[PDB]
Amino acid sequence: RDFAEFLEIYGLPMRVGKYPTGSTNREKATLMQAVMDIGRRAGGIIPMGMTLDFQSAADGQSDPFMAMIGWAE
Amino acid sequence: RILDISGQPFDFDDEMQSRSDELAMVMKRTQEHPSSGVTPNRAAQMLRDAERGDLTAQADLAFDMEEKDTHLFSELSKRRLAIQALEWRIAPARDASAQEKKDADMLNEYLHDAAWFEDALFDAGDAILKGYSMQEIEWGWLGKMRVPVALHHRDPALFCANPDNLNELRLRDASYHGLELQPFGWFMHRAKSRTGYVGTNGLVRTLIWPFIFKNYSVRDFAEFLEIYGLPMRVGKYPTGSTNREKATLMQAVMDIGRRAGGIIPMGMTLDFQSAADGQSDPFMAMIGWAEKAISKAILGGTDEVRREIRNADVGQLARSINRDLIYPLLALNSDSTIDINRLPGIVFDTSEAGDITALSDAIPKLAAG
Amino acid sequence: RVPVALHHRDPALFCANPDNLNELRLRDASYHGLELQPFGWFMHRAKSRTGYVGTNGLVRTLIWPFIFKNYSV
Amino acid sequence: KAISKAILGGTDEVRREIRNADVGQLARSINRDLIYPLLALNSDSTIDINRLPGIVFDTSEAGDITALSDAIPKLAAG
Amino acid sequence: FSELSKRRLAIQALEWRIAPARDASAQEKKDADMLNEYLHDAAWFEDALFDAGDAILKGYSMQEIEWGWLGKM
């Protein structure tokens, strides 16, 4: 079950967006929608004040889970 | 009045129980698909409900699994073709009389001459995955003999177990107690893979989890493959850019492919960031583990065990046939009471094929004595 | 009386009777299709899986691997 | 490999079983659809329902003539 | 479950026969063979044996008995 949970959140880094403190409430909504619209071969234009980065939320291999499963079996 | 196998007299009606006008409403059903968005809590709730006597959601889930999963369908088809390939013959009881032998051979000839027998056996094989298999009986006349014209398969979702007494199926009629099965009008075959009450002896209980894991892993793998090996293209523009200038940059970013060129001003920047990374090893490892688990569950190995499985389920099917189809034919055809302990049965050709090369050793034994 | 020849027909021109499944009918833009003319058709069905007609074919299990393979390639 | 497993059963005995099953189904379909109408139209009298001919396919494994030489001792013994 | 099913199918595949005690009399042999014939003629024996195999995983197996009459027996 832990292996399945790890596989669920694997190989898809989280997309974050940084906005200046002077941004309007509506401007945050547009950025949030734009972050949610990333897939396949995606483009996009970002202002100089804003930044976009990808951070992986899970890393590792399947060797230990499979080793334990095989030992138990 | 026709005497039941248990010895309780009853009245025989040729019309089907499902042909009643009041029962016609429940016969038409919409086959829901509970395999869309499966959740472990949802599966546990479905199994718990099926334990108490629901038997509907579990049946629909099993139907969805037998078509959505390729490996499970392949293994079930292999098992059903293995059981179907055997040969059968009707034999009477030991120390049978001449009349008993005549009845046995006439029934045997009729059943080889009956076309619906093969379809009935194939449909009765559905109790390997589902906990039960229910088929109608359409009685008719053939030379003043009461024989079934044809047998019609029925949806397993239309039956519920009696809460007062489990292990007994009943026809659902939107009531606390379902309608009792009409005697001499049904062919009920159940495969007891695991001991316990009906609705828990099927292969769904153990095969629900590997199916979920394998399907979720493969769908996540496909989604990851969709957004793989193509980094996102971004463009940075100065805060003083015109509205039209942003549109041109956005169009230029969208026009990148093959061996692309382009000129960019000093104030603008262009970069590539990968939106997905990793390998396919863990997804394939999980998929392989689930597939071999399913194969072990269905076939027993990933052979002798296959032979034992065939012998067991063939014996169960033979017992079901003897209890459901053999007795009513003799009871309806014969005017006198049918002896309970002296009726013919069905025996399948469950014998290993000999090797003619190694049986040449019998000649010295025959010479010796 | 012998058949001169047999002509294959498009499977898309037939519909199952809603009142009674497992029975095919010729589509005629009506709630109930025309019943098959006796001694005029040759209907062969392969029951790979038990159930009603139109669900016993190999399409039901082969639809998904085809989609995955084609999209991947 | 999933498609191959679905269609053929393996990626042989299983192929033989598949052939036997679908050949039997096709034979039943032929007997129900084509054999009966020919006799019904050609013959003036009513056609017996339980006494009509059928079609049987040659579903028999080919024997090995080398290993059947063992029948001679059995024939001699009786 | 697979291992338990394999073990239960292995134990179930054996063949059984009722035999009397050593140096048995004619009446003892007759009783033994009549019981043997009855138990092969009894349908519930196979189900009883299969249910008694549940004591491999569980510590015990309990089954009811419904007594009846068959030819004043």
Author numbering:
A (entry chain T): 221 to 293
B (entry chain U): 3 to 304, 322 to 388
C (entry chain V): 148 to 220
D (entry chain V): 294 to 304, 322 to 388
E (entry chain T): 75 to 147
Give the text the authors published on this PDB structure.
Myophage Mu is a representative of contractile nanomachines with a simple tail baseplate. It has the capacity to infect a range of intestinal bacteria and has extensive applications in genetic engineering research. Using cryo-EM, we resolved the three-dimensional (3D) structures of the G(+) type phage Mu in both its extended state and urea-induced contracted state, the latter lacking the baseplate, at near-atomic resolutions. The structure of extended Mu can be divided into four distinct regions: the DNA-containing head, the connector complex, the tail, and the baseplate.
By employing the symmetry mismatch reconstruction and the local reconstruction methods, the structures of the portal-adaptor and the terminator-tail region of extended Mu were resolved to resolutions of 3.4 Å and 3.5 Å, respectively. The Mu connector complex, which attaches the tail to the icosahedral head, is comprised of three proteins: the portal protein gp29, the adaptor protein gp36, and the tail terminator protein gp37. The connector complex in the majority of myophages and siphophages contains the portal, adaptor (the first head-tail joining protein), stopper (the second head-tail joining protein), and tail terminator protein, but Mu is the rarely reported myophage to possess only the first head-tail joining protein. The Mu portal is constituted of 12 copies of the protein gp29. Each gp29 protein contains four distinct domains: a crown domain, a wing domain, a stem domain, and a clip domain. It is noteworthy that the final 124 residues of the C-terminus in gp29 are absent in our structure, which verifies that its C-terminus may undergo proteolytic cleavage by protease I during head assembly. The Mu adaptor is constituted by 12 copies of the protein gp36, each of which comprises an α-helix domain and an elongated C-arm. The C-arm of Mu gp36, which is absent in the X-ray structure, is inserted into the clip domain of the portal to form an extended four-stranded β-sheet, thereby further stabilizing the interactional interface between the portal and adaptor. The adaptor gp36 exhibits structural similarities to that observed in siphophages and myophages, with their α-helix domains adopting substantial structural similarity, but their C-arms and β-hairpins exhibiting conformational differences, possibly due to the differences in their structural environment. Despite lacking the stopper, the adaptor of Mu, which may assume the stopper function, serves as a docking platform by binding to the tail terminator protein to join the head and tail and prevents the release of the genome.
